[PDB]
């Protein structure tokens, strides 16, 4: 029953909503529980970092196309280029994704470098102390300052391109011959008429023959 100048209401409160209400009075209590779980997990993994290595990935939509972020794992081609066995990768903190492909060469080159320098920073303790092996650390540089986050130390350096660039005058390029605005209109109408133009040209060839 409207009586005055009102906004037409739409309140979805005709079911038995009172039976399903989820108040959050345990917001601080839950936070304490997670912090107790993190430090308990970090204690179990005494010298190891808590997290795992991730690759650099670009967002999939025309909006968000500009920004980059972390992915799930390295493709099987990325691991091969850096000379890491497939089975050994998951057991030294590296995350592997077997259902991703490298269509371009920019993404392939960026991830290989990001993975190659990690291999140089790795300290690998031997399986048995009394008998070390060829690939083990020779015990001289086992004592050094280490990192544990691996998400802040290996995060995205810069997600977006630089805001602007400064270049000297007389280096500014010349635009398209027609102009920027008219270059768009011509390119739009060319795709609209791709079908009409194509059949008219083709039927002319058969008409003359």
């Amino acid at each position: 029953a409207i009586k005055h100048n009102q906004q037409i209401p739409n309140n979805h409160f005709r079911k038995h909503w009172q039976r399903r209400v989820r108040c959050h009075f345990d917001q601080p209590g839950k936070k304490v529980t997670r912090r107790l779980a993190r430090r308990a997990k970090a204690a179990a993994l005494a010298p190891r970092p808590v997290d795992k290595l991730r690759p650099i990935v670009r967002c999939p939509t025309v909006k968000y196309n500009r920004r980059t972020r972390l992915g799930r794992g390295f493709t099987l081609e990325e691991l091969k280029a850096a000379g890491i066995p497939r089975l050994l990768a998951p057991t030294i903190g590296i995350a592997v994704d077997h259902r991703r492909k490298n269509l371009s060469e920019e993404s392939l080159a960026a991830n290989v470098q990001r993975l190659k320098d990690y291999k140089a920073r790795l300290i690998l303790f031997p399986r048995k102390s009394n008998k070390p092996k060829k690939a083990d650390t020779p015990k001289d540089q086992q004592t050094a300052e280490t990192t544990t986050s691996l998400r802040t130390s290996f995060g995205v350096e810069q997600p977006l391109a630089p805001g602007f660039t400064e270049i000297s005058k007389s280096e500014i390029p010349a635009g398209i011959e027609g102009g920027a605005y008219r270059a768009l209109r011509k390119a739009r109408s060319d795709a609209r008429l791709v079908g009409v133009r194509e059949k008219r040209a083709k039927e002319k060839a058969e008409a003359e023959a």
């Binding site: 009102q6 025309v62 391109a161 635009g175 920027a180």
Partner: protein, 148 residues
Amino acid sequence: PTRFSKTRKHRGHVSAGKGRVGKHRKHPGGRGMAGGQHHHRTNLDKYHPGYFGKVGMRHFHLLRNHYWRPSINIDKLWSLVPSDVREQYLSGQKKDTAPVIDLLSHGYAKLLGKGRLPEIPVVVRARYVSAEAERKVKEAGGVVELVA
């Protein structure tokens, strides 16, 4: 705070401010939007003209990402460069160097042109550009180039 509200001032007065002849019954007139075409028409036409009917064609499974292109006018173009560098250009100290502005990195796709521009050459890189905006940036010595 209930200590100061009109229900506390109604104590001792019968009918609690709702009237004697009209007694504030349960639901006179119906519930919700009842009577839109029958007895609430006079209210629904003085205000809200256009509630009933169909207009236009329908779209199945609309994805709003296909239609993302925020726009920026031309008089705010100089506000993108940082303040310290900005004052140098307006003061007239460079005289030989031009800035290259990347609209996409700031979150824009189309460059509209609404205000005025000072006579300093610039370079603008945009996905879309208006017809009037291209002329004003060009007569200042600059050029706009599509970037996709």
